[PDB]
DNA sequence: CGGGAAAATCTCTAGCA
DNA sequence: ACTGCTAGAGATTTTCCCG
DNA sequence: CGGGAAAATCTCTAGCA
DNA sequence: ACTGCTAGAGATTTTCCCG
């Protein structure tokens, strides 16, 4: 039940940006989505990223490669 | 209290100082002689 | 420095020397010279060297009117994906901008439109078109196209494509539609190797799927967490770290000094 | 890797599609595709439909995504080939349009529409369009008073149909349905691309005869030999291109 | 790929898809898609992303004419130091540009002047003024102010200073001279913490001193070096490394496999 | 042999291909239809 | 004689730039000057720098500090 | 550090200036300055001169650097205060001008020239100018035929005088001389700045009484106590500001 | 050797029009 | 065969200064 | 573990007007 | 209370592939 939902929400990749870095950071792992903030995991680090700074996808290219 | 010198709109003359009312990421809201203006942070200095 | 400072202001009142010059010529600490320069109104002539970061929410669209061959092309773009919509219109008028906006809001979920302060976008007819479609209007700081960087950059790619296909069409509207097609479905790259159409499909599909999944997770996973405080609502747990929402404030705490009830 | 046999058994029992198997057992989609393709007892999203409606003396030109009920419509000044080709080129630029169904009318069999189909890569072939006509006219009749011209009414009607009326098994609107179906098509195209890429590779493991390649993992290499899928270590198999 | 390539050129002839799109849609290696895009004339629309580097020899000066309050200000700059000379002139004419150039060449050692292709700089009267003073003329690539970056940047600092002191002078020529003074002697910073005047003095004084010193060293230190070749002329030795000049080609060789005679 | 596509002077239309005659640091000399031109390397592509 | 001249020519500082780096490199030590090329020593490394890329000085601020 | 005694002996023998000592023995210039300042038996570049010459009916206004013979001259339309102040402000912007000598003429004692001197920081005081007048007129008479106006001739004359005629002990031209003298002045100003900075610091070493500070090295601290200069390790002395 | 403060270095931007 | 740069504002790293 | 080649990442620029 | 960005060209670092 719940565990399948959690490992499904964690399959989505997140590209984000910090408040002073113009470059987009690589695909993170979505842990929690909210109305104004998303909780991600980039390289064994948990960051909180506002909704206006994040692009969440799923990469269908990758879901099909592995 | 902060002094703000800014460059408002299609005008090369810098104006100021104005009161700082709100500092955001990339833009700031000031008050220059009972006139509220929004100026990006590329066009303002805060002291 | 009382003798060295008084001479520095007297020299600055004439030449407006920077802090380095007044520190070298009057034996001043850098803080004192910087203070003297910072109190001079005539020397505050430069802003800070950064850039802002535009909104890239899934519902954010940027619109702008661009000109080519004497015709007006109204261009829209989905900021999160780069998917563009465009249309040659006979006049920069609130009527046809509202028509374009209603068409766009009918084809895609448009939550907020970001535009500059052109007369066509600030018109009372667009306001009614945004109010009926439930769209929120976010106008930029006047005379700052950087606030519309996504669409302004899209005004360049679209023009660049039109010149590549301008000899395959008699009229400019046909070339504009060819360019929209080419950008949206024949140019790959970006944050997924996608094209603009594939990418936009990914953003909305992901938005709905994640909203439903998180709704289910929050419906099932219902815990309260005490750390160090009040019963913060649990958001996520695992890998020796806990993420919670205490009074509408998301913070990350380690598994230690945190109990889940 | 370890659940290939469980997947094979579940398919021989329930005849499940590869998507569930890749989701339930955590298998690369290529392997599940080969599971469903190994049994002979187990064997649309680019299809738009075009028609022209008359209302209040102007010609409305409607486009319907059959799989989803999503409607693209706008009022055109004349029932001519110029405007039909313009509309269809616009549509091909917005959504991936692969084949359009028409009623062999004069404006649909012109040379301009045919050239627009050739350029956009659309196939032309000459009852959902009638029901969608009826529903769109119903909604226009509802919402007409809220506008002065008819084009604006039509667009408000298209917005209402696409995003405000919901139904079906899950209660989704036409916009969500179209997004979902196009995303599934993207998944299918990517899977076909990857299968086509791997199909020109032969694997020699432990040496044994050549075998078809399915997956190239970080700790294993999945191969199909004599209609049987086996797992071998990367160091125990050499992959060549033919 | 014979079937996959032939369809890719046919699709590129219509949409001009980039290498990524043609690699994903037709199963092509990146090199093949890049080759197909590279053979299309209509797709070569972007130059390479770098910048050049202007000449900063001690004898290099950059001149340009700038406008302010309807008057013409002829500005010069010493590239190596940033020391500027300026003058309000009634007209952009080769006569007064030649006058300014002769004055400049009489006050400082000017070996070469770099200018854009304005009519006043490309005039036959300036050519005579440069020929008499032994100055070499280096014109930039037309319509590329980047080739004059030093002076163009100096057109901005000079204007910025003039506005700071414009209310201390009735006429604009007085303000221009005040600005020249302020830039040259009241603004410190740069590659030595200097001002522009101090820095320029350092460059010419260093040039003469080093020329004399190296003349003496070459007059005394006279050796020939064989390495790995011919008798290369010795330039410097020490710290386990030898620098020599073999047939007008300076190269650095280690002390090993090198003998000094 | 190299093909050079360039942007010569106050003109947004790109021209080419032209023969490469001299590649310097920052600028290049080409030959386009018996016409010798000097174009910076920001305004040229070489293949 | 010659040694004094050599350690005098080595007292001059050189700021230089590489053919693709827009930033000026710190003060090196002048070893040899020529009409078109200067030989310097930056951080125990011997580089050859053209005359048009180098700005040789002496820093009178420093000669007087030490 | 080690040659302070050798420097002191060489000065008590030959009365050498601090520059040679800092160059010959490798001493920080402050220490050599204190050596030359410790003996009581051992005890211009901003000085320009201004005059006006008449030739062919126009007024030439000449400026001479006394220390170097470097000439700044140009033809002005009228012998007035406006133009004199403009010329002097120009000169003050080009070179460091600290005091100007004049012949108390009407155009030199105006209010405009005085205000220009006040703004530029120049001191006003009311036979080298006459000899330079004669030489400049000589050169103008040589070179007049090569020009049509007189201003151009004057400028060519100034160029020839400043950079083509050489003489003196070393055979240098006026331009090289001015550069050298201004560089020596820069050295002197920097040394004075550093001495003024260090003079407000007191050192307690090994504790002994306070001493004047001279140098703050990377392996030593040089101090002067009771008219005697001693070297102490940095860890063996504490520096305080007074 | 250890923090804190001050200095030096780094990064980045407008305007030159 | 020729060529972006300069100075200031804020951030971040180094160095020094006394323990 | 060791090179080489190919892929991925990084850096940087015009144009949007 | 709001906000530069995008895609391509060349350079440099990573990853993989067979020994
Ligand atoms: C009359 C409306 C309202 C009032 O302002 C004007 C002027 N303007 C100027 C540009 C322009 O030159 N952009 C180049 C650019 C520069 C910097 C940046 F960050 C982004 C950029 F796109 C436009 O594109 C544009 O649409 C307008 C416009 O619409 N208006
Ligand atoms: C008629 C002459 C000869 C033919 O060309 C024109 C046009 N032009 C244009 C600028 C200008 O817009 N500079 C801004 C800028 C942009 C980029 C850069 F790298 C450096 C920069 F300074 C000038 O300054 C200038 O002097 C001229 C000029 O003199 N002429
Ligand atoms: Mg110019
Ligand atoms: Zn000031
Ligand atoms: Zn092409």
Author numbering:
A (entry chain C), G (entry chain I): 212 to 277
B (entry chain D), F (entry chain J): 222 to 268
C (entry chain A), E (entry chain G): 1 to 228, 236 to 268
D (entry chain B), H (entry chain H): 2 to 44, 57 to 139, 149 to 228, 235 to 270
Q: What does the original paper state about this entry?
A:
HIV-1 and other retroviruses integrate a DNA copy of their viral RNA genome into the genome of the host cell, a process that is mediated by the virally encoded enzyme integrase (IN). Each step of DNA integration, up to formation of the integration intermediate, occurs within a series of stable nucleoprotein complexes (intasomes), involving a multimer of IN and a pair of viral DNA ends. Because integration is an essential step in viral replication, intasomes are targeted by an important class of antiretroviral drugs, the IN strand transfer inhibitors (INSTIs). INSTIs work by chelating the two Mg2+ ions, blocking the active site and inhibiting the strand transfer activity of IN.
